Structure formats: C-alpha cells, structure tokens
Amino acid sequence: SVGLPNMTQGFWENSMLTDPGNVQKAVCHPTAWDLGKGDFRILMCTKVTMDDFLTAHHEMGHIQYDMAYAAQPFLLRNGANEGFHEAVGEIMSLSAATP
Amino acid sequence: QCVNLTTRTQLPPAYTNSFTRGVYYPDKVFRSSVLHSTQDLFLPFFSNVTWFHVIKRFDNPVLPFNDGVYFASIEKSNIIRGWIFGTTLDSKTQSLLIVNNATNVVIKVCEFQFCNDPFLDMESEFRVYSSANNCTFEYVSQPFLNFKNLREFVFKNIDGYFKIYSKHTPIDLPQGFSALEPLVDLPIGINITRFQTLLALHRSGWTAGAAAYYVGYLQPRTFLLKYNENGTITDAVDCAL
Amino acid sequence: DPLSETKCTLKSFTVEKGIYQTSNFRVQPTESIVRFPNITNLCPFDEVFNATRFASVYAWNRKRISNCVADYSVLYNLAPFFTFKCYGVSPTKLNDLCFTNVYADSFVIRGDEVRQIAPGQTGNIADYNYKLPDDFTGCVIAWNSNKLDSKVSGNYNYLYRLFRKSNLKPFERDISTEIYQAGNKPCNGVAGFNCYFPLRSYSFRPTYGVGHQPYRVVVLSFELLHAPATVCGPKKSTNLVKNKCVNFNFNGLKGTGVLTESNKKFLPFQQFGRDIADTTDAVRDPQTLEILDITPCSFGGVSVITPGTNTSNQVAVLYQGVNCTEV
Amino acid sequence: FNCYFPLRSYSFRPTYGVGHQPYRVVVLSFELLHAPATVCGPKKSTNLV
Amino acid sequence: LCFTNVYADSFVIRGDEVRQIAPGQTGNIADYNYKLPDDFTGCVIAWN
Amino acid sequence: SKFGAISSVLNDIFSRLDPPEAEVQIDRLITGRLQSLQTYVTQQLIRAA
Ligand SMILES: *[C@@H]1O[C@H](CO)[C@@H](O)[C@H](O)[C@H]1NC(C)=O
Ligand SMILES: *[C@@H]1O[C@H](CO)[C@@H](O)[C@H](O)[C@H]1NC(C)=O
Numbered sequence: 001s002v003g004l005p006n007m008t009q010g011f012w013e014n015s016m017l018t019d020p021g022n023v024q025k026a027v028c029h030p031t032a033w034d035l036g037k038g039d040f041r042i043l044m045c046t047k048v049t050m051d052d053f054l055t056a057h058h059e060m061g062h063i064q065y066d067m068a069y070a071a072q073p074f075l076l077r078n079g080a081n082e083g084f085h086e087a088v089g090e091i092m093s094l095s096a097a098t099p
Numbered sequence: 100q101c102v103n104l105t106t107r108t109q110l111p112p113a114y115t116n117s118f119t120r121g122v123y124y125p126d127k128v129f130r131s132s133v134l135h136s137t138q139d140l141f142l143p144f145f146s147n148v149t150w151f152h153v154i155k156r157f158d159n160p161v162l163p164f165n166d167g168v169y170f171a172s173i174e175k176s177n178i179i180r181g182w183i184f185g186t187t188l189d190s191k192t193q194s195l196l197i198v199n200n201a202t203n204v205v206i207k208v209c210e211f212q213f214c215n216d217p218f219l220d221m222e223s224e225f226r227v228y229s230s231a232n233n234c235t236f237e238y239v240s241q242p243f244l245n246f247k248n249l250r251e252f253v254f255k256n257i258d259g260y261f262k263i264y265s266k267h268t269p270i271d272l273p274q275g276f277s278a279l280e281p282l283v284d285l286p287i288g289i290n291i292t293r294f295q296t297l298l299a300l301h302r303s304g305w306t307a308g309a310a311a312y313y314v315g316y317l318q319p320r321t322f323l324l325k326y327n328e329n330g331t332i333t334d335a336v337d338c339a340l
Numbered sequence: 341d342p343l344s345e346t347k348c349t350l351k352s353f354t355v356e357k358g359i360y361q362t363s364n365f366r367v368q369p370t371e372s373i374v375r376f377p378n379i380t381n382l383c384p385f386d387e388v389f390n391a392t393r394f395a396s397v398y399a400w401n402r403k404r405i406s407n408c409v410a411d412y413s414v415l416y417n418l419a420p421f422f423t424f425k426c427y428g429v430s431p432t433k434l435n436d437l438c439f440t441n442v443y444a445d446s447f448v449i450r451g452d453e454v455r456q457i458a459p460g461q462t463g464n465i466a467d468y469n470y471k472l473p474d475d476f477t478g479c480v481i482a483w484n485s486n487k488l489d490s491k492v493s494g495n496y497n498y499l500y501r502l503f504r505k506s507n508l509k510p511f512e513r514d515i516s517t518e519i520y521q522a523g524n525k526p527c528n529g530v531a532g533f534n535c536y537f538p539l540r541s542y543s544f545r546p547t548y549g550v551g552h553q554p555y556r557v558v559v560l561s562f563e564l565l566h567a568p569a570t571v572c573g574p575k576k577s578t579n580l581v582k583n584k585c586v587n588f589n590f591n592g593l594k595g596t597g598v599l600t601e602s603n604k605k606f607l608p609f610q611q612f613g614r615d616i617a618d619t620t621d622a623v624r625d626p627q628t629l630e631i632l633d634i635t636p637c638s639f640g641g642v643s644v645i646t647p648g649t650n651t652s653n654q655v656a657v658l659y660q661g662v663n664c665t666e667v
Numbered sequence: 668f669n670c671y672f673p674l675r676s677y678s679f680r681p682t683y684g685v686g687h688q689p690y691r692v693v694v695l696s697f698e699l700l701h702a703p704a705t706v707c708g709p710k711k712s713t714n715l716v
Numbered sequence: 717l718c719f720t721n722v723y724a725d726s727f728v729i730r731g732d733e734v735r736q737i738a739p740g741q742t743g744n745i746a747d748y749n750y751k752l753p754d755d756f757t758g759c760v761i762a763w764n
Numbered sequence: 765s766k767f768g769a770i771s772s773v774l775n776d777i778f779s780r781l782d783p784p785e786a787e788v789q790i791d792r793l794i795t796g797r798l799q800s801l802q803t804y805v806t807q808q809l810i811r812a813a
Pocket of ligand 2 (some may be wrong): 329
C-alpha cells in the first residue's frame with residue numbers, strides 16, 4: 001500500500017514463522033536474515049499478540065531495506081550508518097500501531 | 100593409407116566420337132507424342148569425347164569439372180566403383196565423395212584429405228583418403244549397379260544442387276538412342292571444379308581388368324526432344340549441329 | 341434467367357430476333373485444398389531441449405541443424421518455456437520460413453542474466469561468455485531449471501568467465517583458462533596478487549531467489565546463404581477432394597479445377613503432366629502416388645435463341661459441344 | 668496444454684535496443700469518393716466566373 | 717486535396733514491426749492485430 | 765509466355781508475391797494476352813477478307 005514491492009516467493013518456503021516444537025530447538029529472538037544472493041528470511045517464533053504484529057512489521061522493515069540495496073555491491077549492501085537500518089523498521093511499527 | 104603406383108604405362112590422351120549420347124530428361128514433367136524444345140546443359144552431338152582405357156593402363160587422372168560432366172563406362176565385372184569431387188581436393192575445402200560397395204552406396208561431403216593415388220581392392224580394402232574433419236551431409240541409397248554393362252552418368256551443379264542422371268544398358272561407343280533418367284538430387288550447395296574417378300584393383304601385385312570409361316563436358320545448347328505415346332524420349336536433334 | 345443474361349451482355353433492354361452467345365458454363369469452384377508429402381525426418385529438437393546435461397556458459401555448445409524439417413510450433417507449445425522473446429522475425433512465420441542452417445546454442449546462466457541475452461546488450465556473459473550480434477536473425481528460449489540444475493549441497497558443474505582482456509566477438513567462444521592479468525606484475529602462471537582464474541563456478545542451489553535460480557537457455561541462430569535452404573517447417577495436409585471444382589496447392593503450384601481419376605501412365609520419376617497446350621492437365625498427389633487429371637471445371641460456351649421481344653418473350657438455350665446427359 | 672492466452676504484453680524498457688523501443692503509430696485514412704467533401708485543405712475561394 | 721471523411725487510428729507497436737503496417741503485408745500484428753486493406757488510400761505516421 | 769513478368773502462371777504470381785506487385789505483374793500478363801488475342805483477330809480478319 002505504501003509503495004514497497006511485495007516480497008518474493010522464496011521467503012515463504014524458506015522462513016519459519018511458527019515455533020517448530022519440542023523436538024526441534026530454534027532461536028526465538030526476533031532476527032531478520034539477509035543471506036545474500038537474492039535470499040531473504042526472517043526467523044520468527046511469532047505468537048498471536050499485538051507486539052508480534054508490530055515486531056513483524058519492525059522486522060520486515062529490516063528485510064524490506066535489504067532488497068532495496070541488493071543492486072549495490074556486497075560490501076556496500078548495508079545502511080549508510082548504523083542507525084538507518086533499525087530506524088526504517090521502526091516507522092513501520094509506528095504506522096501499523098495507529099488506530 | 101596412401102600408396103603411389105609407378106607401374107603406369109604412359110600413353111597420350113585418346114579421343115572418340117560421341118555420336119548421339121548424353122540425352123537426359125531436363126525436368127520431371129510428363130509429355131506424350133509431342134515435340135518439345137528445351138535449352139539446358141547438354142553434351143553436343145558427335146563431339147570429341149576423351150577415351151580412358153583400363154587394362155598396363157591405369158587411367159585415374161584429375162579432370163576439370165567445367166559446367167558439367169558426362170561420364171560413360173564400357174564395363175564388365177564392375178571395376179568402377181565411385182568418384183571424387185571438389186575444388187582443391189584436400190582438407191582445406193569441402194569435398195564430395197561417392198562410393199558404391201557390394202552392399203549399397205555411400206555419399207559424404209566432408210573435408211577429406213584424399214590420397215594422391217586413391218583406389219580400392221573379393222573387395223575388402225578401402226584406401227581412398229586419410230582424414231575427415233567436418234561432415235555436413237551424408238546420404239545412403241541402393242547400389243547403382245564380353246562387355247555387357249554400359250553405364251552413363253551426368254553430373255551437374257546449378258543453384259547448389261548436385262543432380263545425377265543414370266542409365267544402364269546391356270551391350271567403341273555404340274550407335275543408338277537412350278535417354279538418361281534422374282537418379283538422386285543432392286542439396287549440398289558447394290562449388291566443384293575438379294573430380295577424379297575411383298577404381299577397384301584386383302589382387303591375387305595387382306592387375307587391371309578389361310574396362311574403359313569416357314569423359315565428356317556439357318555445354319548450354321538447344322535440343323528438340325521427341326516424346327512417344329508412353330512419355331519417354333526416343334529421339335532428339337541438336338539445333339546447332 | 342437466360343433472357344435477362346442476354347440483355348445484360350448486349351447492354352440493352354430490347355433484343356432483336358437471332359441467336360446470341362452470352363456467357364459460359366463452368367461448375368463453379370467450392371473448396372480449397374493443399375497436399376504435401378508425409379511429414380518425416382523431424383529436426384532433432386528433443387536432443388537439445390530435452391538434453392540430460394547442458395554445458396557451461398563459457399563452454400557454450402554448437403549443434404548445427406540441417407537436412408530436416410523443423411517444427412517450431414511443438415517447441416513453443418511446451419508450457420515451461422514461459423520466456424520467449426524473439427528477434428528479427430515473427431514467431432508465427434517461423435513455421436513457414438526456411439533457412440540454410442540452424443544453430444542450436446545451449447548453456448546455463450542465472451535468472452538475472454537472462455536479460456543480457458539480447459542484441460546490443462552488455463554484461464559479463466555478453467562480453468566474456470557469449471556475445472550476440474546486433475543484426476541477429478534468430479532468437480532464444482529460456483526456462484527455469486531449478487529442478488534439474490540445482491542441488492541442496494550446490495551444483496558447481498556450471499562455470500562462467502568472470503574476467504577477460506577484451507569483449508567477445510559475435511558468435512565467439514572463449515574457453516581459455518589462462519590466469520587473468522589484473523595488474524602490471526606478470527602472473528607467471530600463479531593465481532596470486534592481481535592474478536586470478538578468469539572462470540568462476542556458479543553455486544546453484546534450489547533455495548535461491550527467482551533471479552538466481554538456474555535458467556537453461558537455448559539459442560537459435562538462423563542463416564540464409566547461397567546454399568539451398570534445407571531447413572523447412574511442417575506443411576499441413578488437407579483431405580483429398582475429387583470430382584469437384586476446387587482450388588489446389590500441390591507442392592507449391594496454385595490453380596483451380598476439378599480433380600478426377602486419371603488413366604495416364606506416368607514414369608516413376610515424373611510428377612507433372614502437360615498437354616499439347618503446355619498447360620498442367622495432370623498432377624501426381626504427394627500423399628498417395630496417384631495421377632489426378634486436372635480437368636478444368638466442366639466449361640462450355642452458351643448461346644440463347646430468341647425472337648424479338650417485340651414479338652414474344654420465350655427463349656431457347658444452346659450448349660455447344662456438350663452432350664446434355666451431362667447437364 | 669495446447670491452450671494459451673492469445674494476448675501477450677509488450678514489456679517496454681529503456682534499456683532495450685531500437686528494435687524493441689516503443690513506437691507510436693498514427694494511421695490516417697482518406698475517403699476520397701464522390702460524396703460531398705467535408706474536410707477542406709487550406710485554400711481561398713474566388714468569385715464565380 | 718479535399719476529403720469527405722478522415723479517420724485517425726493510433727496505437728503503439730514494437731520497433732521492428734513498423735514495416736508490418738502496410739497494405740498486403742503479412743505478420744503477427746498484420747494478420748492478428750491490425751490489417752490494412754489493399755485498395756487503401758491514406759497513410760501512416762510513426763515516431764519514437 | 766511470361767510477357768516480361770516473373771512467372772507465366774497467374775495464381776503462382778498471386779501466391780508467391782505481395783498483391784501490390786502481383787497486381788502489376790498480372791497487369792503485364794493481361795495486356796500481353798490481350799495483345800496476342802487482338803493480333804490473332806486482326807490476322808483472322810485479313811484472311812477472312
Ligand atoms: C507480487 O506482485 C506482482 C505484481 O502484482 C505479481 O506478479 C507477483 O505474482 C506477486 N508475488 C507474490 C509472491 O505475491
Ligand atoms: C508404349 O507402351 C505400350 C504398353 O502400354 C507398348 O505396347 C508400346 O510398345 C509402347 N510404345 C513404345 C514406342 O515402345
């Protein structure tokens with residue numbers, strides 16, 4: 001709706017958004033994964049909560065930032081400074097939290 | 100595998116009259132009891148056709164192709180087997196190959212490096228070339244085959260087509276009329292300026308059997324052709340004789 | 341009616357007593373028919389498109405196509421070949437147009453580099469692996485090959501030339517493995533500082549994006565020379581129609597007439613028949629070796645006998661040269 | 668299979684060559700007939716002699 | 717000249733398909749998209 | 765007779781060429797055949813006299 005392109009189909013078959021269970025141990029920390037070579041994943045132990053919805057919007061903002069600089073070289077495939085990467089994902093949560 | 104033969108008995112080129120040989124169907128159209136005039140490459144009547152003798156006579160020279168060739172052979176026991184075709188007659192340019200073994204015929208257009216003295220040797224020893232680099236077309240069909248066999252061939256190269264006309268007649272050149280029917284069409288699209296016959300040598304060294312062949316060149320001229328009721332050519336007249 | 345047909349020819353509304361010839365009787369035509377010999381000796385498209393293994397982009401292969409009929413409709417009919425961008429010739433007319441030789445070029449590249457396979461384009465594949473001329477008469481076919489060219493551990497069998505001293509010429513293959521000279525110091529055969537191997541292996545895996553999944557690319561190059569065009573498209577055969585006034589196409593000849601059974605004895609090599617008028621009166625069907633007398637649709641002159649319209653209105657019709665058991 | 672969408676879309680890109688650049692084509696048809704002409708070229712009338 | 721009625725047809729085609737806009741000319745757009753009559757008086761304008 | 769055209773077969777001319785040039789070729793064929801027919805008619809008239 002805001003103008004960012006929809007994510008690729010590879011995200012669906014490569015990202016696990018639910019806790020695997022007791023048999024498999026997975027990190028529940030909210031982390032966005034830019035593996036490179038056009039591969040983007042988010043490690044999510046998402047629950048049905050408002051925060052996880054805002055956390056998801058905050059973490060897609062990280063990954064959505066990643067496809068933006070995909071054309072730039074790998075060493076330059078980063079934010080201009082350390083503050084930009086988290087800031088661009090925070091406005092996503094701020095806008096999604098509006099009534 | 101090349102072996103140079105020095106047992107040749109040198110002889111100056113011979114000649115004989117062509118009489119009324121070399122008439123072939125110029126197209127594939129049926130005509131009945133009509134006199135039709137056509138202009139195409141033809142062997143002029145009563146021309147001076149070269150005579151080559153095989154007997155110790157070993158006539159395997161290289162002749163120019165010009166606009167066309169009329170190949171005739173007074174043959175028995177099938178000493179003649181095939182021909183070579185090309186311009187530089189080596190691996191530099193594309194060359195054409197015609198061979199007829201005891202089973203069938205083999206047609207290949209490759210960058211052959213022919214032997215200086217190509218020939219064939221029961222017959223189970225084929226020694227006619229040394230290499231084959233780029234093969235662009237190959238064709239296989241049925242074999243073409245007292246002096247009892249007369250074989251007459253016509254070779255043409257127009258618009259990249261290699262036409263072959265043949266006629267087998269059971270019998271110097273005899274007096275009569277016999278039209279030559281088309282046999283095979285080859286869409287090769289190369290240029291040919293020289294050729295060389297391939298002969299089969301009998302090993303029991305080697306001895307050459309009783310055979311002879313003639314080479315005549317075609318010219319563009321007008322013939323008036325007479326068709327019978329059944330559609331075959333029975334007589335013709337050379338309009339410039 | 342014939343009386344009005346007479347008025348129409350005379351360009352008048354009153355007709356004097358006499359006999360007038362107006363028009364002719366040829367049973368009108370009706371259908372359109374085309375016949376060609378049996379479609380055999382199909383070009384080996386399966387051996388290239390359905391090949392078990394495709395070569396690397398730098399070792400891009402040559403497969404010349406000749407002396408066969410090429411059915412471009414079948415290859416286009418395959419659903420997986422979603423990408424089909426064709427250059428210099430309409431895909432529809434490829435089924436009919438003929439060329440001397442067809443060059444089939446096959447290799448494997450990434451999805452993002454598919455756009456580099458085009459005339460006037462640049463890139464690592466364009467400059468170092470495969471350069472395509474601007475005046476390119478032909479076109480390419482590309483499709484996803486993730487299911488075949490990708491392994492979970494990585495399919496490293498496919499390599500691309502990362503570095504070269506100069507851009508490749510059109511239709512030029514460079515398979516040299518000489519160490520690239522990136523600096524002024526000589527390489528001396530050692531891939532050290534400012535010296536690296538020009539070829540890099542693609543690490544294709546099924547867990548990549550759409551732009552990085554392997555894409556098998558088959559490139560078709562078409563050329564026309566003085567040599568005869570021996571690569572033709574398939575020809576459609578229409579069921580035979582006889583004893584009717586039809587338009588026929590037999591091996592490229594056009595005409596109109598009724599096709600009837602013929603008792604003529606053609607020679608085995610002969611195909612066409614001509615009368616003393618030098619007109620095609622007989623023809624041999626390509627599907628079945630039978631001779632069809634191309635009788636002109638029953639044609640005949642007509643003539644109307646009439647008294648003056650000042651006297652009466654009845655007319656009589658004469659068909660000269662026709663036995664009227666046939667009308 | 669054997670059932671395809673007949674409508675294909677031009678994906679025009681500025682990176683494409685002149686062979687694939689978009690071109691705007693305007694087709695003009697004239698009805699030069701015996702009907703009373705309505706489309707007039709630039710001309711000046713004159714008194715009837 | 718003076719015309720009775722004038723019609724303007726406008727569309728967008730590829731670069732190499734401009735030659736297919738001609739009377740009696742065959743092609744994909746000619747056969748399937750836009751065909752001009754043979755006895756056609758009038759003419760076309762194309763620009764980049 | 766070709767009468768200066770590329771082919772002596774009218775339908776072959778229609779089929780193998782575009783109609784814009786096939787029409788010119790057919791015009792050449794038609795005028796040649798009309799010339800032949802009128803020559804025949806004129807000679808017939810003289811012989812009839
Ligand atoms: C993304 O959007 C484009 C354009 O609407 C569409 O073609 C594509 O299928 C979409 N992809 C996904 C995964 O929704
Ligand atoms: C033509 O063929 C018939 C057989 O149908 C034969 O009797 C006749 O002799 C042939 N004509 C010639 C001139 O050989």
